[PDB]
Structure 1
Amino acid sequence: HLTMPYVMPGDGEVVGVGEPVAIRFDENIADRGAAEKAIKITTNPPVEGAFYWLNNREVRWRPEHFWKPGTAVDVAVNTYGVDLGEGMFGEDNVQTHFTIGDEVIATADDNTKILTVRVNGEVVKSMPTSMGKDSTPTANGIYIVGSRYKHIIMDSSTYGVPVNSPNGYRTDVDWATQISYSGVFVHSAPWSVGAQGHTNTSHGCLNVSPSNAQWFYDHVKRGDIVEVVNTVGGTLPGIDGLGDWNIPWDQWRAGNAKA
């Protein structure tokens, strides 16, 4: 019984200031503490960080605050032959190096209905946006940018939710940047340009103009941050998959290796 670790982000990547280290196993880990002790993270400049498990197969490590731009990170997952509990052994090691890019923080403020992109503190874009309508609102919180798609079909049935049901949907969109595993995206919405900056019309996604969505796709990278503030929604879950920063540091740091 072997289990293979997979580390994100990829070796040689540049990622945003929000990117956690992720170590994800292809089997449930019975002894989380054993996995944690086998994983060594080196930072330059050196920063404290801590492990927190999103579920039984994936642990994350990050610092208290967003990474400092230019930080170099080395991840040594020394799991080959290590007993991860219930007679499961690590199949191999993984060794990954990556670097933190520029500080890119985009804030969507429902009081202004503008998505402002700041690069190292400077506004580079101000994008009118239309967010989730009151019945399906966009959650407030900190979102980590994930994958991007030039065109993607978003079908609720991907999440076990029938399309012709209350929480259902089926649409195709261009220039989509993923910001939660729950299915929140920044994307092109030419049909809501009138409403962008004025009225929330979406199902939760951040609708922007075709040009702004393409800009986002081209220039915002994995690990950059989107913050949503002042909506009528709740808070993005800490264990979403891209919601890691919504867990306060004191809780994160304490971890969940015994849970």
Structure 2
Amino acid sequence: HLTMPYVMPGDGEVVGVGEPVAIRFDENIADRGAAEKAIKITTNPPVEGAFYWLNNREVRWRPEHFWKPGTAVDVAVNTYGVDLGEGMFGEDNVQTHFTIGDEVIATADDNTKILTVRVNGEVVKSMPTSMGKDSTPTANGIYIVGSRYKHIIMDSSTYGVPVNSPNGYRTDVDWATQISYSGVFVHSAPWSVGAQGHTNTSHGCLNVSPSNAQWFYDHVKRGDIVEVVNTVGGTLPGIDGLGDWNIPWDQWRAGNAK
């Protein structure tokens, strides 16, 4: 009858200007209202924010606009003794403190096939890219940078596409930075260096050169932003997991506490 909340980002972490507060419970939350009420978020400098639920176990909090660099955020999840619906109570209280680093926004424009990385508004890298081919396009929208891996395999069956099927793959990649839960990454793609900056050839991933992918791995952090524009795809869903900013503020603010 007890649920434990888990908070992200981590205590003491430095994250980019797109990082939402995430509170995930290990059980379904029958009373979203009570859960929201038990969560106290303080910012310095102070900024307005609001809760939106991604699913029945995880709520997000963010401002209307990207964080200001240098902002300190304090999260207190006070669920001990709170009925979070239908006799489910907090196992414990949780606190986290984190801070916002530099503004890092990397824009991938399908018209130019360049991923340009801007730090506090200035261009620091211009990276030729090859994005999703027309039949398997990269969605447009604002993606929040998640985890990074020096080497992993991306396997399409994770996303319900069989490896043996036309859009299927089971691909070893170096220097992979995850930017959607739907399985978009920025990663090293020696195999598309010819096409980078010219033609889209991937299943959705942002292919860049090995040196550029390594740079991105080394310099871009959780919470930084990749914005994709002008592709033939749709828009990354607001409830992707890293797609929070694609929900307009009016709708986000209104919430879904129901």
The interval holding the TM-score normalised by the smaller chain is over 0.9
1:245 aligns with 2:245: yes
Mapped partners of 1:238, 1:178: distance in 2: 16
Mapped partners of 1:228, 1:54: distance in 2: 22
Aligned to 2:191: 191
CA deviation map 1:162-202 (0-9, x unaligned): 21124421101000000000000000001111100000000
Three-state SS of the structure 1 residue aligned to 2:74 is: strand
Mapped partners of 2:109, 2:120: distance in 1: 19
* Residues 177 and 185 in structure 2, CA contact (< 8 A), matched pair in contact too: yes
Mapped partners of 2:238, 2:228: distance in 1: 14
Mapped partners of 2:20, 2:2: distance in 1: 25
Three-state SS of the structure 2 residue aligned to 1:221 is: coil
Residue 134 to residue 160, structure 1, CA distance change in 2 (3 Å): closer
Aligned to 1:34: 34
Shift of residue 145 of structure 1?
0.1
Aligned to 1:113: 113
- TM-score scaled by length of structure 1: 0.99
Mapped partners of 2:168, 2:91: distance in 1: 40
Mapped partners of 1:172, 1:183: distance in 2: 14
Aligned to 2:57: 57
Residue 167 to residue 86, structure 1, CA distance change in 2 (3 Å): farther
Mapped partners of 1:174, 1:250: distance in 2: 39
Mapped partners of 1:40, 1:67: distance in 2: 18
Mapped partners of 1:234, 1:162: distance in 2: 22
Structure 1 vs Structure 2: percent identity of aligned residues? 100
Mapped partners of 2:137, 2:2: distance in 1: 43
Stretches of structure 1 lacking an aligned partner (at least 5 in a row):
none
Mapped partners of 1:112, 1:159: distance in 2: 29
* Residues 3 and 91 in structure 2, CA contact (< 8 A), matched pair in contact too: yes
Shift of residue 161 of structure 1?
2.8
Mapped partners of 1:167, 1:236: distance in 2: 19
Aligned to 1:81: 81
- TM-score scaled by length of structure 2: 0.99
Shift of residue 81 of structure 1?
1.9
Deviates more, 1:161-170 or 1:118-127: 161-170
Shift of residue 158 of structure 1?
2.3
Three-state SS of the structure 2 residue aligned to 1:35 is: helix
Q: CA RMSD in A?
A: 0.6
Aligned to 1:136: 136
Shift of residue 142 of structure 1?
0.1
Three-state SS of the structure 1 residue aligned to 2:54 is: strand
Deviates more, 1:161-170 or 1:21-30: 161-170
Shift of residue 73 of structure 1?
0.1
* Residues 51 and 253 in structure 2, CA contact (< 8 A), matched pair in contact too: yes
Number of equivalenced pairs: 258
CA deviation map 1:212-244 (0-9, x unaligned): 000000000000000000001000000000000
Mapped partners of 2:245, 2:234: distance in 1: 15
Shift of residue 156 of structure 1?
1.6
* Residues 16 and 102 in structure 2, CA contact (< 8 A), matched pair in contact too: yes
Shift of residue 135 of structure 1?
0.2
Stretches of structure 2 lacking an aligned partner (at least 5 in a row):
none
Deviates more, 1:177-186 or 1:150-159: 150-159
* Residues 159 and 183 in structure 2, CA contact (< 8 A), matched pair in contact too: no
